[PDB]
Symmetry: D2
Subunit: 385 residues, 4 copies
């Protein structure tokens, strides 16, 4: 189960470089030079890295220091063959963003947020990124009167519409992906799930430029089924990027390594991504636990990729098993794929077998055979077939 | 705080008529004749009632018995002045629906589901309903292999598109509202939140015919902020109907009377509905607890309306208080309503006050004054000003 | 992975015999004769069965009918070799129990609850049960004023103290196990977790007669770590019985087959039960999904046992792996088992290496190596070592 | 609703002094001198303050600097009349504690934890504290193999038993209170709820020295009913201290001001504390939101006390209302307080009215009248009677 760059595994600089500071404790690890993270991830078989503007260029840098930080980074990329497929803005750390960026109540902050974002879109295009992620971690409220949500959504649409005008006017080949999260660090965050983000995109001026960047742990913080939400994003044609990690239920955002947390959900997720032919990056947004030293950091990151590749093998064996294909027919998954009424509305209304003569008791007696199918899936996951 | 029909309070027949059967216990109350429910609710000041087909006409009724049940119902409506603004289909109780209606794996069940729905649309139009609700309570799964969600969404779109063709071809003045719910009775239900439903509607053939029917308790079963989701539905122009009740956190669907459960959320909800000028029914989908006899049933229903009217008074006093209007300005809610960049993209790029000369430390030091505002809201809710 | 009675797998009659009635739907399967359930479970390799009084003897049976139902049951046990290790009372289904049994507000109901329980203790002893389970599913409230919890706990202690006096006076060799659950069917249930039950037992007159019967899904309905709670029950010497099943997070009580739901938690649970030498029954309190026919029922029950035996094999391989034993030492699990201060309090106070000369920065720099250990556990679970 | 020191309102130094650093953002407020916090809280009508050792004496202080920090603090207390009723240890911030203090896997860390705690017990007694709180925020795990929970509980008992030996040998008049929390910052924390803590105390060598310090938000992070857990702690005689704040459901620990979050739960909590005659401090463990400047900090703290006093008035009016006292009898709260079987076990067995002649259908038909009672409670809370 050894990864190669063909597998398109990517990591955020902020993931392996997380120093371990949490709401109740100081950092437990020293800071990582971005150049060393690139080389260590290349050694592990990763395909590329991603960054916030403030991960790469420390906040408040002159254009000279900025130039030097980028040149060092590009030289590490050229030395290793690593790519940069995605980039994003930090609109959450600095105190100025304490009430949001695009939806801050203060107008001057909203304008500064847009200028800070545009500057990093230029940098992302230069380094070759195809997707620009927006996570509005501070867009939200702790109390009901602080934020008129209809006005906030107006301001959110205005900001994204302006970004789309910018990339259109410059001729950039880059697309945006909105990353939802239901809460933390705000009490409630705007666009809290995949569904709310998908709905919001359809109200933008150029909806075709925008998709979603769902994260495993974020939908599970609302107790939702992550493979189900990913299917809906694929069904709408909007899965532009994905963030893989692990989460143990409804609580603070844990960002465990992929495969930890809900293991069966990770299996069904890989099954879906591989059978639907998702061809984007397999990006890990995780945090090595602050119990770990740097040896633990790299073991945790290697484990992300290993677990994807074991699950990929097991799901492929599951779908190729003739006994499984036979069980899928026994449960009528084949009938689910067939149109309900390709004969049209009038034919349906005139069909007495659809109502007047339908034997409801005979249909109700047919078992679905779902438990035998699920135990075959369990046996395959566990390598017990 | 006495209700009048001008307040447009409505109840489902299945609410006051719930016999108290739950997953672990037998019924504690006898069944109610729909005609008696109509008269008792009219006496309490309700505006109207709603029904599932199987609430009004017992499943498996001949057209003769069906005719007699409807005539008795209409005579009770004419006797009392009660209206019927909404109707819906029961696609969840009969065993035939154990794997869903519109997205059942069995094709013949999906066809029967559509025929059963269309028959009740005709009845709803006859009784004057303006909204037809669809709650897909059995559309979902307990295990991952049982349901290909992309195929299921294809089948869901096909069913709703067919219903829209039917009402268009008949010339009916009726609109559809999709009611989301994240789980129960299935392990996960398709279109689990307001956001997923809003996103799905935009993929239908005639999106203008469809909106949402959110329920307080359902969004709170995912730990989401219900007033926030309602603002997004209003922002999209899709709040066609609403179900009011109470829920104590993330657990089974409690359907407590409105005002119980999360009291502060109910205050912010009423504040939003009244300030946005929602003019549809205030519908209660609740269950009087099975501890109660029929006297408790009617006290519980009266309490639904009372609590709405107390909250309406307190939110109106809150917004009219000059000290509150002054605090809203202190927190810059007025600036949130103003465009970020009505001067356009180029002017923003050239504005040095938006970036090169923006004083980030001075802006960051400005407090938002949100806690004083929220304590004014608390004082108003509690009648302590 | 074939079960034998040596594995001590047991099932409730109400589990495989669940007819599929849920809060929103009618039954999907016919009722099972208890005698047929016994024979079909014996065929699958189960060790025994358990029952509520009302599962075996239908409520309101004369002593003659009661005698005949028991004789038929005993003949099925003698025919198959199946044992009855546990029994319990139904104090939740009949309407009389709508406000509880032992803590109902009505005194006459509380007295009836105790008489109904005592009658079934006699029957349990006759059939050879060693443990008598009490699940107070109706002890609780939906509203705050309905139940003074201090008075309710007084009444709960009085009821259990009376049961202990009864079994002591009769000379029965039977012990009680309290089964906690946080909610459903009441809004909040008294003694909602393992911890609350363990605390309550220590206030009884004869605490040595009482232990806990934890259920996987119930602690997970509060988002708690089930293996952690089981360790605390074992640490106190109170794990008298256990209910195995599966649950997908914080929501209604799903009662999935064991191994579904949180798979990694099931692995750590089996690891704990086997390494601590738990010798009681492995009891399954699950519900075959109502999508299933009777063939699905038996496949679901067989899957319960299969999944325990696969997990038992993987956890045993994990603990026997020298590379794992070496990693456990690397993470200092051996030091966790050694006393902090066997040298006593005075020696600790005088030990300058414990404070005045303790190198806090050197200790803080030591990584815990927990991620490498957990990936070894993952590899073992998945059969990838 | 103006507070006076007679109301015994206390605040942690770390509450109003929280600088606003969270997992995703830098501090938004400058640090507060503890002496200024004391004077500003005295001005607001608080009774006293509490502290962690590291709040008052910065970590790594020489005995000279330590002496000066304490003298400045004592002079502020003498100047204002403020008391110090409780103190606690910081065993969570420094990196050395990344795997716990009392249950760290490393033995030398566990010894250092005990020495650090004992030093602050001496200081607490000097300043007059009656209660010493222990919150084991780092005692726990993110993965299953990292922590044998039975060994960890052995180590936890050993540490607390040693602290009890220390205070006994010194003749201190101080008691310990264990503060539970289910998760954050560890993935799962040991002793996660009030119940688990109460159970653990009964296994200590001197159980009478130990009680619980429950926090509103912590039990609500497990979706539990906080007034119910407080009743159980009072019933066991173990409510030594209490932490008041607000929390909006199952998510990260919000620490909102008291009265925000679940408002009805706060009403029932105050009703319980006042009717049971709790005489300890009303301590607020809250965080002013990082949106606020220092004016917002003090408004948030004043709001804590105001909201307690409004709720105290409303609950007292509720219990004194004759119409409520009559409704309590209608719901048989009086019968709940009467013994089930003061006539003893034999009399119960011989009582034919308790079983053979009990009219189960007549009892089942009696409504509990709980909804009318709860609407009276709602009317009183809202000031609408
Ligand atoms: Mg995350
Ligand atoms: Mg992410
Ligand atoms: Mg509901
Ligand atoms: Mg509803
Ligand atoms: Mg259960
Ligand atoms: Mg059970
Ligand atoms: Mg807290
Ligand atoms: Mg606290």
């Amino acid at each position: 189960y050894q990864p190669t760059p063909e597998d398109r595994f990517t990591f955020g600089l902020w993931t392996v470089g997380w120093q371990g500071r949490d709401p109740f404790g100081d950092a437990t690890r020293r800071a990582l030079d971005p150049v060393e993270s690139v080389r260590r991830l290349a050694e592990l078989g990763a395909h590329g890295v991603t960054f916030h503007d403030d991960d790469l260029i420390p906040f408040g840098s002159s254009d000279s220091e900025r130039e030097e930080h980028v040149k060092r980074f590009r030289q590490a990329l050229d030395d290793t063959g690593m790519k940069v497929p995605m980039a994003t803005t930090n609109l959450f750390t600095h105190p100025v963003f304490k009430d949001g960026g695009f939806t801050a109540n203060d107008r001057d902050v909203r304008r500064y947020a847009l200028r800070k974002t545009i500057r990093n879109i230029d940098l992302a295009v230069e380094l070759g990124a195809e997707t620009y992620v927006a996570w509005g971690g501070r867009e939200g409220a702790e109390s009901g009167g602080a934020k008129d949500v209809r006005d906030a959504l107006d301001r959110m649409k205005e900001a994204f519409d302006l970004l789309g005008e910018y990339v259109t006017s410059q001729g950039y080949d880059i697309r945006f992906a909105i990353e939802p999260k239901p809460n933390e660090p705000r009490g409630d965050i705007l666009l809290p799930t995949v569904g709310h983000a998908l709905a919001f995109i359809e109200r933008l001026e150029r909806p075709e430029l925008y998709g979603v960047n769902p994260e495993v742990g974020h939908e599970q913080m609302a107790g939702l089924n992550f493979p189900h939400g990913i299917a809906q994003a694929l069904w709408a044609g909007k899965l532009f990027h994905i963030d893989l990690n692990g989460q143990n239920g409804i609580k603070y955002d844990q960002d465990l390594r992929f495969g930890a947390g809900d293991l069966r959900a990770a299996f069904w997720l890989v099954d879906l991504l591989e059978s639907a032919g998702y061809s984007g990056p397999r990006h890990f947004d995780f945090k090595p636990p602050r119990t770990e030293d740097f040896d633990g950091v790299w073991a945790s990151a290697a484990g992300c990729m290993r677990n994807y590749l074991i699950l990929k093998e097991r799901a492929a064996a599951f779908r190729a098993d003739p006994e499984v294909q036979e069980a899928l027919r026994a449960s009528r998954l084949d009938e689910l794929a067939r149109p309900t009424a390709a004969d049209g509305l009038q034919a349906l209304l005139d069909d007495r077998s659809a109502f007047e003569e339908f034997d409801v008791d005979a249909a109700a007696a047919r078992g679905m055979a779902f438990e035998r199918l699920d135990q075959l899936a369990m046996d395959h996951l566990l390598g017990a077939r």
